[PDB]
Amino acid sequence: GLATILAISTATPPNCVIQADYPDYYFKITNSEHMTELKEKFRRLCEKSMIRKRHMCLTEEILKANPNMCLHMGTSLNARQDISLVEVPKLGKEAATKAIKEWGQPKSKITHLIFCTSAGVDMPGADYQLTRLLGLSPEVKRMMIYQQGCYAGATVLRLAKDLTENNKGSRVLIVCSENTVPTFRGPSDTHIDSLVGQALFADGAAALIVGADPDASIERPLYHIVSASQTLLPDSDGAIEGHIREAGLTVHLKKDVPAFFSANIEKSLVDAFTPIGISDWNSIFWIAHPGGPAILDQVEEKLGLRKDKLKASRHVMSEFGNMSSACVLFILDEMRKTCLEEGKATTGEGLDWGVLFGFGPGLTVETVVLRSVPIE
Amino acid sequence: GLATILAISTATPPNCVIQADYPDYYFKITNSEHMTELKEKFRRLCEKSMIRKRHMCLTEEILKANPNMCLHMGTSLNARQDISLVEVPKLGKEAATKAIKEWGQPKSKITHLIFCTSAGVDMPGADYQLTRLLGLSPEVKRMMIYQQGCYAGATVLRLAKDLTENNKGSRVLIVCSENTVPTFRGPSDTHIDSLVGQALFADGAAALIVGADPDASIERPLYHIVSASQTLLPDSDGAIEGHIREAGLTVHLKKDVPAFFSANIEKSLVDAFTPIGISDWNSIFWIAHPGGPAILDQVEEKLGLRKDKLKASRHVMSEFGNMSSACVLFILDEMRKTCLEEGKATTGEGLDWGVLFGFGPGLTVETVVLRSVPIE
Ligand SMILES: CC(C)(COP(=O)(O)OP(=O)(O)OC[C@H]1O[C@@H](n2cnc3c(N)ncnc32)[C@H](O)[C@@H]1OP(=O)(O)O)[C@@H](O)C(=O)NCCC(=O)NCCS
Ligand SMILES: CC(C)(COP(=O)(O)OP(=O)(O)OC[C@H]1O[C@@H](n2cnc3c(N)ncnc32)[C@H](O)[C@@H]1OP(=O)(O)O)[C@@H](O)C(=O)NCCC(=O)NCCS
Known part of the structure; x- marks a missing residue:
């Protein structure tokens, strides 16, 4: 009778950056190539990151259209929100559709939805947007986990355990969707820790179906x-x-x-x-x-x-x-x-x-x- | 064996505004007294609101120090965050202390914390701030419910039910803390719905202890x-x-x-x-x-x-x-x-x-x- 993961799927934006090429790209697009030492420091960070590639829905083209995003501290929250609030549920929907296909049951059997993101807050939240995009039941019981950062992939499992085990027949869809739109910014020789984030953070979404008491004829723990x-x-x-x-x-x-x-x-x-x-x-x-x-x-x-x-x-x-x-x-x-x-x-x-x-x-x-x- | 409310407490900031006096105060502090018709419309909204008084930690003095908050769309998020992110857990702590006193058990028996606010997001969240301010156990199991708006007082009961009923011995502290720092703004004759918010929204915090299987010798459902x-x-x-x-x-x-x-x-x-x-x-x-x-x-x-x-x-x-x-x-x-x-x-x-x-x-x-x- 334990909460059981029944399906897992992932999704990323198409646009990919090779990490070996990123210091040159980053210092060029932020107009900071005169920062010769800071660029080499960033090069070391990217080399030590043990990351080969990253997906980022943010392109050169979008960044050119939003130049304040390329400054270190340019006024840009409205621009970031406009981009991210659409992207978060859209990428989450891609992962969710695949998880539901793996699971193989009708989406009308999804009784609970947990949505998790730190990429942008809005009212109603990404859980609402995903419910409408997927056509989940209006009566789906939603929990919106905003801005809890890097431990929240475990938080949603902790949440899903209590939801599914306390509600007989329940099936929870979990969606986590994250991106670099709110965090991308230009370099500063007084904010090295910000460069660390530029070397590490990436876009991606994952979706799971969780439920207690799996039906062995139709479900696979x-x-x-x-x-x-x-x-x-x-x-x-x-x-x-x-x-x-x-x-x-x-x-x-x-x-x-x-x-x-x-x-x-x-x-x-x-x-x-x-x-x-x-x-x-x-x-x-x-x-x-x-x-x-x-x-x-x-x-x-x-x-x-x-x-x-x-x-x-x-x-x-x-x-x-x-x-x-x-x-x-x-x-x-x-x-x-x-x-x-x-x-x-x-x-x-x-x-x-x-x-x-x-x-x-x-x-x-x-x-x-x-x-x-x-x-x- | 149902989740049971064992204690309830509330808190408000000291500063109070009499609703009958608010249209004059609001249109004066936002420098909009030339908006004679819009002021009368706001007067009707405040009269029809069926509100006698409201608590607001925002004072004339604070608003004078942050004049962009008095415009309709003045750049002011940073100023609002600086104020609200401190106020939210502080007001929540006042309510929590009183709820725990009513309950009468040691705070080391609080196993779970739900914090809820739409007044400002930060990392770590108000749940973290409250845990440290109250000296809850480092191992308290926290759920941070951000930006879910006006239905979230019921959401936290829906959450608390599954947490307490799925975890024997658990005791959940719920804290909701809300304020007008992010929403207060000056008037606009093309944004009447924004005036409705200025007539209605207020500050307050509430705290509850919830648990299944109450101990009748020490607890009161x-x-x-x-x-x-x-x-x-x-x-x-x-x-x-x-x-x-x-x-x-x-x-x-x-x-x-x-x-x-x-x-x-x-x-x-x-x-x-x-x-x-x-x-x-x-x-x-x-x-x-x-x-x-x-x-x-x-x-x-x-x-x-x-x-x-x-x-x-x-x-x-x-x-x-x-x-x-x-x-x-x-x-x-x-x-x-x-x-x-x-x-x-x-x-x-x-x-x-x-x-x-x-x-x-x-x-x-x-x-x-x-x-x-x-x-x-
Ligand atoms: C960032 C990281 C990949 C760098 O790897 P590393 O090169 O093997 O570790 P180093 O100590 O040699 O760091 C290299 C340089 O970056 C600097 N640096 C690393 N982390 C830093 C930080 N948080 N703030 C400021 N500078 C930092 C180091 O001081 C060093 O600078 P220097 O050589 O000019 O003196 C590694 O430190 C790491 O994984 N850190 C944890 C990242 C983290 O905090 N993740 C959570 C994000 S929410
Ligand atoms: C706001 C409220 C107290 C006004 O009470 P009321 O005067 O009895 O209702 P009325 O229809 O007569 O409203 C009076 C005026 O405000 C205007 N108004 C009310 N709500 C409005 C809105 N959402 N947007 C724009 N204008 C609005 C009305 O059009 C009217 O203007 P007018 O007399 O110049 O034509 C009442 O409408 C109410 O409670 N609304 C629900 C508020 C709400 O949405 N709460 C959720 C907030 S998250």
């Missing part, structure tokens, strides 16, 4: 959501902040963000897995939000993870970059697809128990304990 | 949350919209908003109460979001409600105005207090079953079915 926790890390106030301003969403990142997450992550593992009798962190499958490669590297080092535990998470980071809440859902899709292709015994890389982590502002750690499903 | 639904009204797209812009939160209201809600409300009553065997809408106690007096008047007329059914809802509207999500929680507090004072048989005006309605963008109707508790 992929993961079970066993537990979901959330905690704030000690002494971490101010380490990640994002402010919605006249210049868009400004991003503020302290250098010891990776150290906070790696220094505290084992406590979440202990609290989540000791009650189950589990203590070997290499004996569980891992989905870790790739907020940056340094978070994943330092967690790996601190815990002594074998070097392939984080392969699925690093693969999504490499092929898609930091798509905020969407990343962990992309990673679940990657792992179950790869396990089916490679003939593994379970959707969790042949292991039975797994952990999914969201990392973001607070500092907040979201810890979800999963069970895999056998692949017969 | 006030209401049980039996069911919670949400629906979009047919052909209503665009009737209420709110946009987060460089000039703040702009408000857009069609004239037939009251007709949409009154024409469709009985369907929600039918769906919610027919399965319980209830059809007499005068036989249940009522909590109705006072989005404007015309909504309450037209619902009353359409359904044939006796003229005192909406007394508690109209009382809160009169003494506090439209505080968005906080209103329905103020009304629950008023009704249980009044019923205790007047010696009624139940916290629901002596009736056993009750309905609580949230109204807002979509158009969305939130329908919560309540049970009262006997007063011995």
